[PDB]
Design brief:
It is classed as photosynthesis. By secondary structure, this protein is α/β, with parallel strands linked by helices. About 35% of the residues lie in helices and about 15% in strands. It is built from 15 helices and 15 strands. It starts with 9 loop residues before the first helix and ends in a 5-residue tail after the last helix.
Length: about 400
């Protein structure tokens, strides 16, 4: 629905000054400022290489940090992964930018200083966005992780640049998180895990509009079980969400969604990787014990339910996978999805703990898509509209 940088050809790009908003906000080691994860930079280079190879003059902008950094720590890694030099400018507006842009040749890339040094950036003030656009001809948004904010560099500048299109990274995020979910190939199974059903309501509700089955895991199952009148030992529950838990089960049936909860759990006598454990049916949770993983019968049931899936969305671990005795639920599910991807199934991962889970489970490169922008991922999987995306041209 939104035009892409790929919809533009060399006539549109050669010799043009292209303002690019990228997500280069890579984690830094506090003492050395070395990059501990350059995934975001690597994800950013295909848009940049396409532009530079078509003769564009790229003006690249990003943030790095509520504490702000200059972009110095990323210049060298970006150039190495770009395969092209990178000229730094110590401002994102004004005569120094204008001078640097004037000296550029086709196929060169400029890196402007961190836009968030101006308070006008997060205020989305139009006169500042105007100054940002003053040395550009057109606009590419490749910063999905900030597309839910309305900032000058992510939204305000589009009012002064034509066309305004989505980069390749942003388009991929939309292709998987929006397209693949809204027009899904079936069977479409959603997997949602978490400690608290309160944190996962809207994503669960959003996914029930589209999916065939929902698998529910993690510590939040115990509020569902308490809502059935079952004992849940010392498992943490949200008593104020008990009625909500009943409504979700009802809503699933009304919409034709198979709701799957575990039938057995691994319980611990304390929240400890070294706890004593038992594996019990969910109807006989011992007093004073807490459920820290789904049990083997539930692992088998969930795997069977996934065995013919053509789309899977996974958000949230099945148990405390950081504890080896309680990891089998998450690791098994992670590796089931990893085996589905080569069979044609579309496997999509979202959430900070699910990405730490797929790393610990050794499947981090084995999925269709792992979302680079956490807070934007949830809001898109929520069905609300991102100001950064809405501002782009229609295809």
């Amino acid at each position: 629905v939104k035009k892409s940088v790929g919809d533009l050809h060399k006539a549109d790009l050669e010799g043009k000054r292209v303002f690019v908003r990228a997500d280069l906000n890579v984690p830094l080691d506090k003492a050395t400022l070395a990059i501990t994860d350059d995934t975001r930079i690597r994800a950013a280079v295909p848009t940049l290489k396409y532009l530079l190879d078509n003769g564009a003059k790229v003006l690249l902008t990003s943030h790095l940090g509520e504490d702000k950094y200059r972009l110095t720590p990323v210049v060298a890694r970006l150039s190495e992964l770009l395969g092209k030099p990178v000229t730094k400018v110590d401002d994102c507006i004004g005569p120094e930018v204008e001078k640097a842009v004037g000296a550029m040749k086709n196929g060169e890339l400029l890196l402007l200083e961190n836009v968030r040094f101006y308070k006008e950036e997060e205020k989305n003030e139009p006169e500042f966005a105007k100054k940002l656009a003053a040395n550009a001809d057109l606009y590419v948004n490749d910063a999905f992780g900030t597309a839910h904010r309305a900032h000058a560099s992510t939204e305000g500048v589009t009012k002064f640049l034509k066309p305004s299109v989505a980069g390749f990274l942003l388009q991929k995020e939309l292709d998987y998180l929006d397209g693949a979910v809204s027009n899904p190939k079936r069977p479409f199974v959603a997997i949602v895990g978490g400690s608290k059903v309160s944190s996962k309501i809207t994503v669960i509700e959003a996914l029930m509009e589209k999916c065939d089955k929902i698998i529910i895991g993690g510590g939040m199952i115990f509020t569902f079980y308490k809502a059935r009148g079952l004992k849940v030992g010392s498992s943490l529950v949200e008593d104020d969400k008990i009625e909500l838990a009943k409504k979700l089960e009802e809503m699933a049936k009304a919409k034709g969604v198979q709701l799957l909860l575990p039938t057995d759990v691994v319980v611990a006598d304390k929240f400890d990787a070294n706890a004593n454990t038992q594996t019990v049916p969910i109807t006989a949770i011992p007093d004073g014990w807490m459920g820290l993983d789904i049990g083997p019968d539930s692992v088998k049931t969930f795997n069977d339910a996934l065995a013919d899936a053509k789309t899977v969305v996974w958000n949230g671990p099945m148990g405390v996978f950081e504890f080896p005795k309680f990891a089998n639920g998450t690791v098994s599910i992670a590796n089931t999805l990893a085996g589905l991807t080569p069979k044609g199934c579309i496997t999509i991962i979202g959430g900070g703990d699910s990405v730490a889970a797929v790393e610990q489970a050794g499947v981090a490169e084995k999925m269709s898509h792992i979302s680079t922008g956490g807070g934007a991922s949830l809001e898109l999987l929520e069905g609300k509209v991102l100001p950064g995306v809405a501002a782009l041209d229609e295809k």
